[PDB]
Design a binder for this molecule. Structure first.
Ligand SMILES: Oc1cccc(Cl)c1
Ligand SMILES: [Cl-]
Ligand SMILES: [Cl-]
Length: 162
């Protein structure tokens, strides 16, 4: 198991513009296109991102390409954050995959409000962090996925992904 397989499991793969759990235009492997409600805005964004007139549809390779760049950006976004980096570097390899997944899902922004949980994770108080992490809009909005990530951080193993 690795980050790609793990997020591929959590985000699915769609080759046509779709709305995500929050109602926003997205495509491929969880790639957010825009928060605007204008489908035309979304198609534009898509064309800009792919480099061609897509008409709301992309290829698997196109989707995989967007994904790579997105994982990359996420990690990099972590390492660039001063509040984040130190937490991330204190963790082992599995748990680091769980940090990337949350950031990929919510942005470095969404994640900045987890301060308390971040501290517990840095302190390696797993069970405590897991409880703190559940007390959030994120777990209440996408519980099944939040569960798998939380278990991941709690255990340091890939069991929730089987
Ligand atoms: O979202 C998270 C959670 C833990 C560590 C980092 Cl770096 C990010
Ligand atoms: Cl792009
Ligand atoms: Cl879910």
């Amino acid at each position: 198991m690795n980050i790609f397989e793990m997020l591929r499991i959590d985000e699915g793969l769609r080759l046509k513009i779709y709305k995500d759990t929050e109602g926003y235009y997205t495509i491929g492997i969880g790639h957010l296109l825009t928060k605007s409600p204008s489908l035309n805005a979304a198609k534009s964004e898509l064309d800009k991102a792919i480099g061609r007139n897509c008409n709301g549809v992309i290829t698997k390779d196109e989707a995989e390409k967007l994904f790579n760049q997105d994982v990359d950006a996420a990690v990099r976004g972590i390492l660039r954050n001063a509040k984040l980096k130190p937490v991330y570097d204190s963790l082992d390899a599995v748990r680091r995959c769980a940090a990337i997944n949350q950031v990929f899902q919510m942005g470095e922004t969404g994640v900045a409000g987890f301060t308390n949980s971040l501290r517990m994770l840095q302190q390696k108080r797993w069970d405590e962090a897991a409880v703190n992490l559940a007390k959030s809009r994120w777990y209440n909005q996408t519980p099944n996925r939040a569960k798998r990530v939380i278990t991941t951080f709690r255990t340091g193993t890939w069991d929730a992904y089987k």
